[PDB]
Amino acid sequence: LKLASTMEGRVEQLAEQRQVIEAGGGERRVEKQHSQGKQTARERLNNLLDPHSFDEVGAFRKHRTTLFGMDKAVVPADGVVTGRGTILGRPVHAASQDFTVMGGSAGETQSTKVVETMEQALLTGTPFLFFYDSGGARIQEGIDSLSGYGKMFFANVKLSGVVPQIAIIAGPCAGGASYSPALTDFIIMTKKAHMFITGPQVIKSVTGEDVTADELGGAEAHMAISGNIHFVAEDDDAAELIAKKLLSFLPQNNTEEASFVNPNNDVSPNTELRDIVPIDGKKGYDVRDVIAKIVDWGDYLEVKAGYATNLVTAFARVNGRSVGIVANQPSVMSGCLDINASDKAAEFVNFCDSFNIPLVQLVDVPGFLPGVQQEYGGIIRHGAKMLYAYSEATVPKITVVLRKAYGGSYLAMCNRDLGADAVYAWPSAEIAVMGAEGAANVIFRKEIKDAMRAEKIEEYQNAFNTPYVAAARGQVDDVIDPADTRRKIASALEMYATKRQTRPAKKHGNFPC
C-alpha cells in the first residue's frame, strides 16, 4: 500500500492494517472455527500467556511464493502467530497456526517464522509452545513448503533436551506435519483435533479401507492405541490449563533445575501407606493411591494416563521439588511390563534426565508380559529402552520396592546396579531372580521324583525372596515401615540434590529403537 501523508495518519493507517491482519481469514471463517468448538490462533495465545504479555513478531510478514495464485493471495501472517510472552512470569516463545488462513496450510514463510521463533527460544533459553491447526504443507508452494518442514524438524531436534517443547494439537494436523509434534517433548490433543501421517482419503484409495479422521487419528486413538500423545484435552480451554500445569514442573532450560513450587515441608509418618498394598500377591490395587500419599498435597500430573496403563508416569513434587514418578500398576495386567509400557517409561525417564528432574520409582512388578506377540513385537529391544534410559540417567534416582520385583523387570525399574542412589524395601518387598516355583522346577528337577516340591519351593522362597535377604546383600539400603516412605524419599532427595555423576565422553550412546 501507499503511506499516508502525516505521522498521525500513518499511525492510524498502521492500526487499521494491523486490525486487518489480526482478523485472519475473516469473520465467517472465524465464526466457523468457533462453531466447531475451537478458539482462534490469537485467542489461544491470549488465554495461554499472561495478560498483555504477548509480544508478536511477524504480523506483517508475508509469503514470497507466486505460483498457482499465491502471487495474488492475501494470507495474513502467512497463517501463524508467533512471538514471546510469559506464563506465570516466565519468559516463553510460542507459535499458533491460524486455520482460518488457507486452512492453516504451512507456507514456506510460515515454517520460517516458526523456526526463527524456535531459534530465539534456544538462544535465550526459554520454553517453546506451539498450537497446531493445519492442513499440512501448503500445496500451491510445492517443494518450497516441503523445505520449510525439513527446517522445522531439524530445529525441533536442535532444541531437544535444551529447552522444553510443548505441542498442542487443537484441530487438524494432516501429514508429515505431525512429525514436529513427535519431536517436541509433550503433545496435548483436544477432542476436536486430528493427527496422522496418511489421511483417510489416501488410505482408502490405496488399501481399500474406509475410516473416519476421528477413528484414524482422533485424540483417543492416539492416546490409547498409537501411544503418540501425553495428554487428551476436552477443548482448547482445558489444553491451555494443562499446558500451564505441565510447564510448572519444568525448568526454563537444561542448565537449571525447575523452581520449587508451593513446598510442603511436612514429612511426618502416614500409616495409611501400610494398607494400600495387600500382603496377598493375588490382590491388586491402584498404585496412584500410594503416590497420592507421598507427594506434596497429593498432587500429580499423570503423563500418558490412558496409554499402557499397566505402568504409571507422573510429575509431582516432594518438598516443592519437581520429580518424575515411575510406578508399576498391579491392578492392570498384573503390573507386568510390556512393549508399550517400556516405551512409556523410557521416554519419561529420558526426558526427566535431560531436564534435571529426579526420578522416583515405586516397584511391584512380576516380570514382563508373557505372549508370542510380545516376543514377535520386539520386547527385547523395547524393554532394553528402560535399562538404557535409567543406566544413562544422572539425575538422583530413588527407588522404593513395594512388593514384587522379579528378574529383569526389577532391573528395568532401576535398582542400585542401574545407579539408583537410594533403594528402600517395604516389608512386603519380594525381590527375586524368578518365582520360587519355576526356580524349584529347575534346580530341584531331579531330587523331585512327590509333593517334595512343596518343601523346595518354600526353601527357595525363604532363602532369597525376603526383604531381609535383599537387605543382607546390600541390594536395598534398609527395610522400612511403609508409613515412613515420604520421609525416606524426601531425605534422599535432599542429600542427592548435589549429586554430580561423571559419564564417559561420547556424542551419544546407542539408544535402542
Ligand X SMILES: C[C@@H](C(=O)O)C(=O)SCCNC(=O)CCNC(=O)[C@H](O)C(C)(C)COP(=O)(O)OP(=O)(O)OC[C@H]1O[C@@H](n2cnc3c(N)ncnc32)[C@H](O)[C@@H]1OP(=O)(O)O
* Residue numbers at the binding site for ligand DXX (CB under 6 A): 136, 174-175, 198-199, 202, 367, 407, 434
Q: What angle do CA 284, 286, 292 make, to 5 degrees?
A: 145
Residue 509 within binding range of a second copy, rule CB under 8 A: yes
Q: In what order do the strands lie in the sheet with 231-233?
A: 55-57, 80-87, 90-97, 128-134, 165-173, 186-190, 231-233
Q: Judged by CB under 8 A, which stretch of 236-244, 280-288, 310-318, 364-372 contacts a second copy?
A: 364-372
CA distances from 134 to 96, 177, 329 (A): 10, 8, 37
Binding residue for ligand X (CB under 6 A) from 139, 143, 157, 497? 139
In this structure, is the dihedral angle defined by the CA atoms of residues 340, 341, 342 and 343, taken in order, positive or negative? Answer: positive
Taking the complex as a whole, the smallest distance from the CB of residue 352 to ligand X amounts, in Å, to: 25
Residue 408 within binding range of ligand X, rule CB under 6 A: yes
Which of ligand DXX, ligand X, a second copy, none sits in contact with 498, Cβ below 5 to 8 A by type?
a second copy
Nearer to a second copy among residue 241 and residue 448 (C-beta): 448
Residue 38 within binding range of ligand X, rule CB under 6 A: no
Which residues, in sequence order, are bridge partners of residue 303?
313
Taking the complex as a whole, the smallest distance from the CB of residue 306 to a second copy amounts, in Å, to: 15
DSSP-derived 3-state class of residue 68: coil
Taking the complex as a whole, the smallest distance from the CB of residue 448 to ligand X amounts, in Å, to: 13
Cβ contacts of 265-272, under 8 Å, gap ≥ 24: 265/319, 265/320, 267/319, 267/486, 267/487, 267/490, 267/491, 268/487, 269/481, 269/483, 269/484, 269/487, 270/483, 270/485, 270/486, 271/483, 272/483
DSSP line for 125-153: T--EEEEEEE-SB-GGGHHHHHHHHHHHH
Q: Judged by CB under 6 A, which stretch of 139-147, 354-362, 386-394, 395-403 contacts ligand X?
A: 139-147
What distance in Å separates the CA atoms of residue 352 and residue 322, rounded to the nearest whole number? Answer: 10
Taking the complex as a whole, the smallest distance from the CB of residue 132 to a second copy amounts, in Å, to: 12
Window 169-188: residues binding ligand X (CB under 6 A) = 172, 174-177
Residue 262 within binding range of a second copy, rule CB under 8 A: no
Taking the complex as a whole, the smallest distance from the CB of residue 327 to ligand DXX amounts, in Å, to: 38
Residue 217 within binding range of a second copy, rule CB under 8 A: yes
Residue 123 within binding range of a second copy, rule CB under 8 A: yes
Nearer to a second copy among residue 252 and residue 319 (C-beta): 252
Taking the complex as a whole, the smallest distance from the CB of residue 209 to ligand X amounts, in Å, to: 17
Binding residue for a second copy (CB under 8 A) from 104, 171, 175, 251? 175
Q: What angle do CA 242, 113, 148 make, to 5 degrees?
A: 100
Residue 407 within binding range of ligand X, rule CB under 6 A: yes
- In SS3 terms, 376-407 reads as HCCHHHHHHHHHHHHHHCCCCEEEEEEEEEEH
Residue 176 within binding range of a second copy, rule CB under 8 A: yes
Q: Judged by CB under 8 A, which stretch of 267-275, 287-295, 321-329, 388-396 contacts a second copy?
A: 388-396
Contact 83, 57 (CB under 8 A): yes
Residue 142 within binding range of ligand X, rule CB under 6 A: no
- Positions touching ligand X (CB under 6 A) are 102-103, 105, 135-140, 146, 149, 172, 174-177, 199, 407-408, 433-434, 442-443
